[PDB]
Design an enzyme around this catalytic site. Structure first.
Site, PDB file in Angstrom:
ATOM      1  N   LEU A  22       0.880  -1.081   0.066  1.00 57.98           N
ATOM      2  CA  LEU A  22      -0.018  -0.154   0.015  1.00 57.98           C
ATOM      3  C   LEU A  22       0.824   1.246  -0.016  1.00 57.98           C
ATOM      4  O   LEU A  22       0.375   2.334  -0.549  1.00 57.98           O
ATOM      5  CB  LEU A  22      -1.034   0.068   1.329  1.00 57.98           C
ATOM      6  CG  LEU A  22      -2.184  -1.064   1.134  1.00 57.98           C
ATOM      7  CD1 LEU A  22      -2.414  -1.364   2.750  1.00 57.98           C
ATOM      8  CD2 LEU A  22      -3.152  -0.454   0.194  1.00 57.98           C
ATOM      9  N   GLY A  23       1.907   1.332   0.543  1.00 60.40           N
ATOM     10  CA  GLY A  23       2.897   2.394   0.583  1.00 60.40           C
ATOM     11  C   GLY A  23       4.244   1.804   0.829  1.00 60.40           C
ATOM     12  O   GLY A  23       4.587   0.722   1.475  1.00 60.40           O
ATOM     13  N   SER A  24       5.284   2.633   0.546  1.00 58.57           N
ATOM     14  CA  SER A  24       6.767   2.289   0.770  1.00 58.57           C
ATOM     15  C   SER A  24       7.340   3.580   1.120  1.00 58.57           C
ATOM     16  O   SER A  24       7.788   4.445   0.487  1.00 58.57           O
ATOM     17  CB  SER A  24       7.415   1.628  -0.451  1.00 58.57           C
ATOM     18  OG  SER A  24       8.418   0.655   0.032  1.00 58.57           O
ATOM     19  N   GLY A  25       7.809   3.611   2.508  1.00 59.61           N
ATOM     20  CA  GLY A  25       8.673   4.726   2.942  1.00 59.61           C
ATOM     21  C   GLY A  25      10.085   3.899   3.201  1.00 59.61           C
ATOM     22  O   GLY A  25      10.326   3.031   3.256  1.00 59.61           O
ATOM     23  N   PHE A  27      11.904   4.021   5.882  1.00 62.90           N
ATOM     24  CA  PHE A  27      11.953   3.180   7.222  1.00 62.90           C
ATOM     25  C   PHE A  27      11.148   1.913   7.048  1.00 62.90           C
ATOM     26  O   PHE A  27      11.554   0.761   7.383  1.00 62.90           O
ATOM     27  CB  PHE A  27      11.214   4.135   8.087  1.00 62.90           C
ATOM     28  N   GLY A  28       9.879   1.822   6.072  1.00 57.99           N
ATOM     29  CA  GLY A  28       9.640   0.650   5.947  1.00 57.99           C
ATOM     30  C   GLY A  28       8.476   0.523   4.873  1.00 57.99           C
ATOM     31  O   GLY A  28       8.062   1.480   4.257  1.00 57.99           O
ATOM     32  N   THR A  29       7.597  -0.517   4.989  1.00 58.18           N
ATOM     33  CA  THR A  29       6.690  -0.832   3.879  1.00 58.18           C
ATOM     34  C   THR A  29       5.382  -1.381   4.687  1.00 58.18           C
ATOM     35  O   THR A  29       5.242  -2.385   5.301  1.00 58.18           O
ATOM     36  CB  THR A  29       7.329  -1.936   2.976  1.00 58.18           C
ATOM     37  OG1 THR A  29       8.454  -1.411   2.434  1.00 58.18           O
ATOM     38  CG2 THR A  29       6.453  -2.282   1.757  1.00 58.18           C
ATOM     39  N   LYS A  49       2.330  -3.215   8.362  1.00 61.37           N
ATOM     40  CA  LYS A  49       3.653  -2.276   8.399  1.00 61.37           C
ATOM     41  C   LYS A  49       4.938  -3.175   8.876  1.00 61.37           C
ATOM     42  O   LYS A  49       5.054  -3.875   9.869  1.00 61.37           O
ATOM     43  CB  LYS A  49       3.240  -1.204   9.291  1.00 61.37           C
ATOM     44  CG  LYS A  49       4.571  -0.263   9.380  1.00 61.37           C
ATOM     45  CD  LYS A  49       4.004   0.652  10.514  1.00 61.37           C
ATOM     46  CE  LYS A  49       4.369   2.331  10.170  1.00 61.37           C
ATOM     47  NZ  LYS A  49       4.090   3.197  11.034  1.00 61.37           N
ATOM     48  N   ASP A 139      -1.003  15.129  16.063  1.00 57.10           N
ATOM     49  CA  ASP A 139      -0.629  15.162  14.376  1.00 57.10           C
ATOM     50  C   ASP A 139      -1.906  14.987  13.932  1.00 57.10           C
ATOM     51  O   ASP A 139      -2.044  14.489  12.892  1.00 57.10           O
ATOM     52  CB  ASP A 139       0.374  14.283  14.154  1.00 57.10           C
ATOM     53  CG  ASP A 139       0.934  14.270  12.684  1.00 57.10           C
ATOM     54  OD1 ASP A 139       0.535  15.162  12.085  1.00 57.10           O
ATOM     55  OD2 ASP A 139       1.552  13.544  12.295  1.00 57.10           O
TER      56      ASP A 139
HETATM   57  C1  LIG Z   1       3.884   5.242   6.486  1.00 54.44           C
HETATM   58  C2  LIG Z   1       4.099   5.003   4.909  1.00 54.44           C
HETATM   59  C3  LIG Z   1       3.115   5.024   3.988  1.00 54.44           C
HETATM   60  O1  LIG Z   1       3.037   4.992   2.799  1.00 54.44           O
HETATM   61  N1  LIG Z   1       1.764   4.970   4.748  1.00 54.44           N
HETATM   62  C4  LIG Z   1       0.489   5.158   3.869  1.00 54.44           C
HETATM   63  C5  LIG Z   1       0.329   3.778   3.470  1.00 54.44           C
HETATM   64  C6  LIG Z   1      -0.188   2.847   4.423  1.00 54.44           C
HETATM   65  C7  LIG Z   1      -1.212   3.149   5.290  1.00 54.44           C
HETATM   66  N2  LIG Z   1      -1.811   2.442   6.670  1.00 54.44           N
HETATM   67  C8  LIG Z   1      -0.908   2.594   7.729  1.00 54.44           C
HETATM   68  O2  LIG Z   1      -0.045   3.078   7.802  1.00 54.44           O
HETATM   69  N3  LIG Z   1      -1.354   1.860   8.817  1.00 54.44           N
HETATM   70  C9  LIG Z   1      -0.687   1.559  10.067  1.00 54.44           C
HETATM   71  C10 LIG Z   1      -0.508   2.685  10.962  1.00 54.44           C
HETATM   72  C11 LIG Z   1       0.178   2.529  11.975  1.00 54.44           C
HETATM   73  C12 LIG Z   1       0.766   1.081  12.342  1.00 54.44           C
HETATM   74  C13 LIG Z   1       0.613   0.320  11.606  1.00 54.44           C
HETATM   75  C14 LIG Z   1      -0.331   0.256  10.364  1.00 54.44           C
HETATM   76 CL1  LIG Z   1      -0.401  -1.247   9.114  1.00 54.44          CL
HETATM   77  C15 LIG Z   1      -2.710   1.094   8.759  1.00 54.44           C
HETATM   78  C16 LIG Z   1      -3.463   1.135   7.223  1.00 54.44           C
HETATM   79  C17 LIG Z   1      -5.061   0.539   7.372  1.00 54.44           C
HETATM   80  N4  LIG Z   1      -5.355   0.503   6.136  1.00 54.44           N
HETATM   81  C18 LIG Z   1      -4.803   1.237   4.980  1.00 54.44           C
HETATM   82  N5  LIG Z   1      -5.547   1.293   3.755  1.00 54.44           N
HETATM   83  C19 LIG Z   1      -5.093   1.925   2.448  1.00 54.44           C
HETATM   84  C20 LIG Z   1      -4.030   2.884   2.449  1.00 54.44           C
HETATM   85  C21 LIG Z   1      -3.475   3.220   1.243  1.00 54.44           C
HETATM   86  C22 LIG Z   1      -4.051   2.853   0.063  1.00 54.44           C
HETATM   87  N6  LIG Z   1      -3.696   3.513  -1.350  1.00 54.44           N
HETATM   88  C23 LIG Z   1      -3.051   2.733  -2.312  1.00 54.44           C
HETATM   89  C24 LIG Z   1      -3.029   3.483  -3.546  1.00 54.44           C
HETATM   90  N7  LIG Z   1      -2.440   4.905  -3.398  1.00 54.44           N
HETATM   91  C25 LIG Z   1      -1.418   5.140  -4.362  1.00 54.44           C
HETATM   92  C26 LIG Z   1      -2.480   5.586  -2.069  1.00 54.44           C
HETATM   93  C27 LIG Z   1      -2.416   4.690  -1.046  1.00 54.44           C
HETATM   94  C28 LIG Z   1      -5.398   2.304   0.242  1.00 54.44           C
HETATM   95  C29 LIG Z   1      -6.088   2.004  -1.200  1.00 54.44           C
HETATM   96  C30 LIG Z   1      -5.848   1.851   1.199  1.00 54.44           C
HETATM   97  N8  LIG Z   1      -3.809   1.937   5.176  1.00 54.44           N
HETATM   98  C31 LIG Z   1      -3.175   1.791   6.432  1.00 54.44           C
HETATM   99  C32 LIG Z   1      -1.011   4.537   5.743  1.00 54.44           C
HETATM  100  C33 LIG Z   1      -0.415   5.624   4.660  1.00 54.44           C
END
Ligand SMILES: CCC(=O)N[C@H]1CC[C@@H](N2C(=O)N(c3ccccc3Cl)Cc3cnc(Nc4ccc(N5CCN(C)CC5)c(C)c4)nc32)CC1
Ligand SMILES: [Cl-]
Length: 294
Positions: A22-25, A27-29, A49, A139
């Protein structure tokens, strides 16, 4: 302070399968995935994560796990558990529609006043919960609100150690309080009421501090009756005890939510529809949402 008896659940990495990232920083993925507690015949959609080891980072992700394991409220994200692999993994309920900020930009043409006002209520309930639990977010912002369904949102990224969203006592004195959070709630609403726009666009980060002592604030969004904008502006008063309490914001927005179009004027409001998983589709057959697994 009372003993914190959150249960911390350790999961086995063999109990879950990463599916899409869903995303890649750096620090982590973070991955979309499923979790299958063996012999329980359920498939829980999750987000995973994972960091690939830094002594300092390992410590912070466990701090995050510590906080996320301690809250339990329908408008707050919580941790399902962690997994102790080479690099630790935080396991969260999946929020299928991503962040509110993305969701109001991409679905702008279909977001009516009923949704906008309910999101405000739900975010206020979230922060009032974090207030009951004496936990200050520090935040809050539209990007740190995740949408489980378009009808249900939850706060994330809370309580972990962005000036444009900061109360003034947070800028000058680096003070952080629940009433400092009330300010960022204000900016957050403004982000939703403008359908995703950027606050104080094109300004020096530094100027913002005297802009606010001078007395400037953010503009009134077009769709905003004076009744709504006034509530925001009260979140940006300088005396933090004149700013509203989240528990009041819950009430006032919930009032407006009963007659949405009296408080937000949106061309073609009643034409708009947003995907309701009950309404349209829930689109590997046997699956339970994490919220129904507790
Ligand atoms: C930071 C690095 C980073 O890139 N973070 C972002 C990606 C991960 C996201 N995230 C968490 O960090 N969570 C979390 C928080 C704290 C501890 C553990 C955890 Cl797991 C729980 C979490 C739950 N659900 C989603 N649903 C969801 C997300 C993105 C997308 N789209 C895909 C297509 N697009 C290009 C845009 C993104 C979709 C379609 C659905 N995202 C989550 C937060 C923001
Ligand atoms: Cl900022």
């Amino acid at each position: 302070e009372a003993p914190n008896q959150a249960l911390l659940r350790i999961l086995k990495e063999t109990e879950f399968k990463k599916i899409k990232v869903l995303g890649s920083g750096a620090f982590g993925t973070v991955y979309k995935g499923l979790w299958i507690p063996e012999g329980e015949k359920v498939k829980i959609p999750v987000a995973i994560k994972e960091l690939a080891t830094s002594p300092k980072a390992n410590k912070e992700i466990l701090d995050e796990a510590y906080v996320m394991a301690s809250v339990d409220n329908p408008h707050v994200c919580r941790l399902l558990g962690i997994c102790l692999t080479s690099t630790v993994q935080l396991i969260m309920q999946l929020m299928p529609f991503g962040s509110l900020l993305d969701y109001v930009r991409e679905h702008k043409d279909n977001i009516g006043s009923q949704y906008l006002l309910n999101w405000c209520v739900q975010i206020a309930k979230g922060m009032n919960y974090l207030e009951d639990r004496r936990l200050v977010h520090r935040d809050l912002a539209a990007r740190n609100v995740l949408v489980k369904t378009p009808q249900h949102v939850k706060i994330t990224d809370f309580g972990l150690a962005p000036i444009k969203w900061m109360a003034l006592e947070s800028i000058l004195h680096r003070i952080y309080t629940h009433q400092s959070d009330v300010w960022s709630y204000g900016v957050t609403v403004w982000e939703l009421m403008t359908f995703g726009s950027k606050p104080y666009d094109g300004i020096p980060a530094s100027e913002i501090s005297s802009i606010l002592e001078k007395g400037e604030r953010l503009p009134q969004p077009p769709i905003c009756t004076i009744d709504v904008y006034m509530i925001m502006v009260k979140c940006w008063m300088i005396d933090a005890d004149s700013r509203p309490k989240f528990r009041e914001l819950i009430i006032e927005f919930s009032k407006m939510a009963r007659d949405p179009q009296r408080y937000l004027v949106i061309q073609g409001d009643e034409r708009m529809h947003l995907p309701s998983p009950t309404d349209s589709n829930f689109y590997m057959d046997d699956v339970v949402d994490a919220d129904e697994y507790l």
